């Protein structure tokens, strides 16, 4: 039939600007990602700066230095280090939470290696029958986090002190 | 030396500390002399 010798040729279109930027979402094959159960999802910038960058300077900042003491306090904190960095969301990883808290959580990180000598484009079918190419603004590799009980850091330190766990570890996990 | 069919009289070890702990200080005198003579005379050299 015609399938054994079909020749398909389509026009290529590259619009100058698109309202929505195009990115790449890559899942590892072993993760067995399935979209049938993806009833809902939440993709947002991370807040890990809570732990290591911001609102960590909450209490000492609002303690209440004033007057000459205020001037000195601000100047002293600034000159002590090199002005702590705050939230600049566009340069931070992405957090994905599928089906709320019940479903799996993935973390995407921008591909550090830039494509100074490469570009990536995506071809999508359209009713007009011409391929459309859109540049890849960013590449993200998402890796899942198990929805299982997580050892507390303090408890983990206590357990690690007993590095010689002669007793079965599985029972220890059950106890936690 | 205790093992059967091993001569207790002639069996000797090269380690002088073992000779001291097992056989005594006089035995070490002789054993140290023997070992030093072996290192001196291996090349054929002679020391009085």
């Amino acid at each position: 039939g015609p399938s054994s010798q079909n020749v398909t040729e389509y026009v290529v279109r590259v619009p100058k600007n698109t309202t929505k930027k195009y990115n790449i979402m890559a899942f590892n094959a072993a993760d067995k990602v399935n979209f049938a159960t993806w009833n809902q999802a939440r993709l947002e910038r991370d807040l890990s700066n809570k732990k290591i960058y911001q609102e960590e300077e909450m209490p000492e900042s609002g303690a209440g230095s004033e007057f000459n003491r205020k001037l000195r306090e601000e100047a002293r904190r600034k000159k002590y280090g090199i002005v702590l960095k705050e939230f600049r969301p566009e340069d931070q990883p992405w957090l994905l939470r599928v089906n709320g808290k019940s479903g799996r959580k993935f973390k995407g990180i921008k591909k550090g290696g830039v494509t100074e000598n490469t570009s990536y484009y995506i071809f999508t079918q359209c009713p007009d029958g011409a391929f459309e190419a859109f540049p890849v603004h960013n590449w993200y590799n998402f890796t899942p986090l198990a929805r299982h009980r997580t050892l507390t850091a303090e408890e983990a330190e206590e357990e690690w002190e007993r590095r010689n766990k002669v007793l079965n570890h599985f029972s220890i996990m059950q106890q936690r | 030396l205790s093992e059967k069919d091993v001569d207790p009289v002639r069996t000797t070890s090269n380690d002088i500390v073992e000779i001291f702990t097992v056989l005594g200080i006089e035995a070490v005198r002789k054993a140290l002399e023997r070992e030093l003579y072996h290192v001196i005379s291996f090349d054929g050299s002679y020391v009085n």
Binding site: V11, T19, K20, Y120 | -
Partner: protein, 134 residues
């Protein structure tokens, strides 16, 4: 329905998309005008048990690009877009990957050397000065 919700309609429709790695000269030729709505034509010829993919450069643009396919079974890829209206959406799932390679072998190295020289222009070197500055 919320700001952080991801429009998975593309996944539900199982829209298939193709990912291609293309060189900088082609992308820069496209970016030169980038607004004419046309950069070339993609021609795919299939035989009894073999398929070939090629791209022809537009005649105006120039003033053959064979495509080599890559297996996508080792990694699952999807495309998602962040709309300017803060409405994230999924366009489709990548079903095929391809690479675009230059046709010229040796004379293409000349253009590569020119690109290398252009990239080396910002590199600054110590300059020898004949007369001591007064």
């Amino acid at each position: 329905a919320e700001r952080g919700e991801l429009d998975l309609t593309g996944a539900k429709q199982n829209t298939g998309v193709w990912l291609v790695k293309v060189p900088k000269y082609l992308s820069q030729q496209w970016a030169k005008a980038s607004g004419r709505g046309e950069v070339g034509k993609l021609r795919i010829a299939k035989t009894q048990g073999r398929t070939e993919v090629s791209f022809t450069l537009n005649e105006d643009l120039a003033n053959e690009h064979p495509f080599v396919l890559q297996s996508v079974g080792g990694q699952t890829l999807t495309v998602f877009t962040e709309s300017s209206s803060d409405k994230l959406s999924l366009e489709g799932i990548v079903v095929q990957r391809a690479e675009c390679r230059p046709a010229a072998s040796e004379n293409y190295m000349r253009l590569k050397r020119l690109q290398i020289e252009e990239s080396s222009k910002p590199v600054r070197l110590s300059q020898q000065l004949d007369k001591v500055v007064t």
